[PDB]
Symmetry: D3
Subunit: 241 residues, 6 copies
């Protein structure tokens, strides 16, 4: 292998410069099938790789795992192999009342409630998506005919206290996160998520292009339709080549 | 009778305008408004000179901010309570990337917060990002004019000298965290220095207000009327 | 012609002047300048309006700063490049203590650093403290004019609204670290809010420049109730003893 | 089908297990569980693979965490909802001290918090300290196998590369505060770099849970099976 | 003549490498006069030092004074003269309801609510005790048979606002300490104290060994014989 | 008896509102005897208190000890007893070439390189001396005919690394204190010291009046009569 974790060489990619990065390894094969010549590359830990083809051009589908740490490994080791554009896809939980289940979220920038982003750029540096990547995801959202929301996403290093959950073992949430959800709602933040801040800060500070699209499956305020998000990310990839 | 503290304006003076073009210099306010229809001078208090014009029969306000985020925060807030929801920022900048030339136009996606006023609206971890539709109309307007357009991240400083790492000063001294900072921003892909975007974009993005940032390059620091003005007006037509 | 980028001033315009009286408003420069000998308009660029005058035979420059630290730091820096070593801040302010009345005078010893520009010259642990000789001259001058004077600390905020804990805004809300902040400032004996002193006093105290501040109270947000012009006469009188 | 969101486990699956051995890799859990009585696969979801085994007549769960604090915080929290109170960490590590060789054993008393997730449970002032009973058990288990043991502090980073001051990257750039950071940790007596302990030790010590870590040295950047035996032996004394 | 504050020389120690460190100068005499041939060394400000013998080996009892600043001087100047092991003895007030007056508290690590500890290592670095020092203090506590609690201690730079005391001249507490006591006890902190964070950060970042034991005098939540004998018994097994 | 640490009743002051605060407990007696009718009050730990009389008015002299933590106790507890004015007399070493041994330093404000000051006010709050106290110390310095310097002082929580001293056991200075002396020097900072930040912050934020005067005995860059005369002379004008 030419890289440490992914178990991949530069030859496997075959000139691929764009990668689609889901979170779950099980969804890697699924996305690859939408494109020409889908082939399994490697599988080590939370990193599953597949190659495909769009308009003759090779593309990578690779999993990140949960959190910025594992994501920082994946982006770096793909960048070592020639990947310059990264398209993030996931499923999230909205914190806004107007955002429904089945709706699509395209992230312009992330609230940096993580630790890994700080390893690439200081806190005052924006976790902003590449504009040409964001443009492609928005145009792809219109074509599929998705109910799309464009804005800011809060990226947390925890699923529980960082997203202000109290149904836990301790029932305790640290001071600075106590009452923070409502503050993000007041600031117009669409959703909680766990990888974007690291991903976006990594790319925006190292000359790489990044963009994120996610499908809403739950809403935390208001107490399976169609997977538009997957079709959007591959459509956007076509225009970014 | 003014309904706002600093601008010297009331709700009726805007004519139901919901979009503002915000240059830095009060002198430049007159010149932008006259490129549009029915240019009427509204008020001139301190660094806040306001004019009113028309785009395709729709009321548009042009108001200066002055230098820095403190006076910009005053203008944007008092325009926001006067009914303004969209703010398009026009200005001049000094690029730090060697491939950017004098006469090139820069569109800011997001700002590096090297200011203080942005913290008064959102914590540092919150992104100083521009509104997508504002940025898109701003990029599309740049193609029509045919200007050499650079799109990316801007470093927004609270000072002209040490925060931009200028050494030819009275002290010839820069505080330690700003030493070698320009180089660090250069490697991170930051294109330029200015002084107002971090405050503008943060206070708008955290308060449900649309914001866009455009600037024309007049100086390059690697080697130590105009397009941008035409671009901001064209973009303002496609926003409303 | 100009030796500096913003002010539009040469070193010849000052004629050897080493002291600057620095208001905020450009429209106050001419008025302060005419209280002294041979007043002349030097330059007017944006928020920076400068006038030269003579005080006891010695040249003095009056120059506006505009609102906020960023603009203040430009004027002070460029004046320091042009030879100015002593800076006297003049303005008008509100108050946050019930015992401070409209018409009183405030001499600032140090500022609470709620700006960002001060960080560009000194770390947060460094004090935003006025020059003793500048402060003393302003205190003596206030006594000579017969003004009711308060000496203490000013909160210097980068915003007019949320940093001064105002709720009548478009959002109607304040960030969590400014919630109840006015209450704890007035609990700490802070006199007032203002928007420039943290930058001025820090950038001077960390660069071998002398700085002082005096302000006229025109309103009190704690009070209700119903001529002075002391502040203007104080800054001029104090300047004579610092020359 | 499950009491928890991510692990795919119910409380009854653990059969009263209050102790958890937590490796990083879901491939390494089956092997650990088979070193004990009655090993049974419970669930495999994402980076979380869980096995139930028996030790001295008492049930024990072995569960992977994945890479990083975020995924570790999910596993530990959800295991604690299932009744786990003791968390023993096993892994393989590098070293930044020249006197520590390949094949040696490291026991972590506390971690340098170069992560983000630890701050979600306790502020930076709060120490990322291991439980005394867990650490004591691990040191005593290290003697019984005759291992070259080092006891001390570990640096725990949210990245594999810049946070561990690696320049062999795509950009070759390391941030200001991590430039020269490895030499700083070396002079302070820090043994090694790692990516999960700051999160693990902080959330446990601040929520009334017991935690300890043992690791095996497989490489040393300053130079040119004991660990698995220790963690199991130490789990016996913690019941 | 070799150190600036303590007024001691290498020869005054007589090859001693262990120091028992109380805060109060008056208790130094009692700790020293519990071992073989106690000799008074020097008294400068709050730095009263004595020399005694334990198992035929020279040992030092030296006062630190109140707080990290004065503690940092004493440790540093002791270290210059050849001291490598420091054992903190003192009296404390518990913040847990299950800890009684007369109980013994052993500190594994400290919450850093001080400034002096930052002068040696950044906040992310853990203020953790040396393991062998903690081991000996724990064993000594069982060897004397005292009600022992092992865990985390909050180390404040102030007696009043840092420990959330409102019965003061101002009658108010700064906003980040407002409600902080409830936070520390929810995170499992045993007690409030004023010296440990500095002591533990100093030693663990310099290659020095440090431990802490304290006897409970008061408990604010509810309605020296042991600790002194423990620190002496523990000092026996460290050389 | 009326207080915890100091051991003084309100009547032990006899209506005293001004306190002269040296660092050394052994200097309290020498300073008090320069005034009328000096009488010992209490000596507990590093807190030695005497009562003297100036112009018929009762004053109190009390030691602070080394550092902010011990100083924070004395100030607040004297404030409980009715003291509203604090004047610090001390000895110091300058970092500025033009300042000579024997010169007198009047501190306008302190650089907060401490921890205790944060317990009373956030970092952005200035550690500024009271103007009437500062003016009195300047006038008294003129009357004695002392070479006086008026400006900013750096108040460190440590004697060694915080003042950038490399002549130490480790020979190491933490990252952010590396090159700090040069930075303070270029910012017109006069000297290093250890108590002013805590003293001035807690007084200016709680309605107490504070000033500081110190005598230069050493200069790093290269008689004792004054300062002590100045602080007593200034105290008279503040009554």
């Amino acid at each position: 292998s030419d890289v440490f974790h992914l178990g991949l060489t530069k030859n496997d990619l075959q000139g691929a410069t764009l990668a689609i990065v889901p979170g779950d390894p099980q969804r890697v094969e699924k996305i690859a099938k939408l494109m020409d010549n889908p082939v399994h590359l490697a599988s080590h830990r939370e990193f599953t790789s597949w190659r495909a083809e769009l308009d003759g051009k090779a593309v990578i589908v690779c999993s990140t795992g949960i959190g910025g740490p594992s994501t920082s490994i994946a982006v770096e080791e793909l960048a070592q192999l020639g990947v310059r554009t990264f398209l993030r896809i996931g499923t999230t939980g909205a914190i806004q009342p107007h955002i429904n289940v089945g709706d699509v979220l395209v992230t312009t920038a992330a609230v940096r409630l993580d630790g890994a982003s700080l390893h690439f750029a200081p806190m005052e540096f924006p976790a902003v998506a590449d504009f040409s990547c964001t443009t492609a995801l928005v145009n792809a959202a219109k074509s599929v005919g998705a109910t799309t929301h464009i804005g800011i996403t809060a990226s947390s290093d925890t699923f529980y206290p960082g997203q202000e959950r109290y149904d836990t073992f301790s029932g305790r949430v640290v001071r600075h996160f106590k009452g923070s959800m409502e503050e993000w709602q007041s600031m117009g933040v669409m959703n909680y998520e766990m990888e974007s801040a690291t991903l976006l800060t990594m790319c925006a500070s190292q000359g790489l292009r990044a963009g994120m699209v996610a499908g809403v499956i739950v809403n935390r305020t208001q107490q399976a339709t169609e997977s538009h998000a997957v079709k959007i990310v591959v459509e956007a990839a076509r225009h970014l080549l």
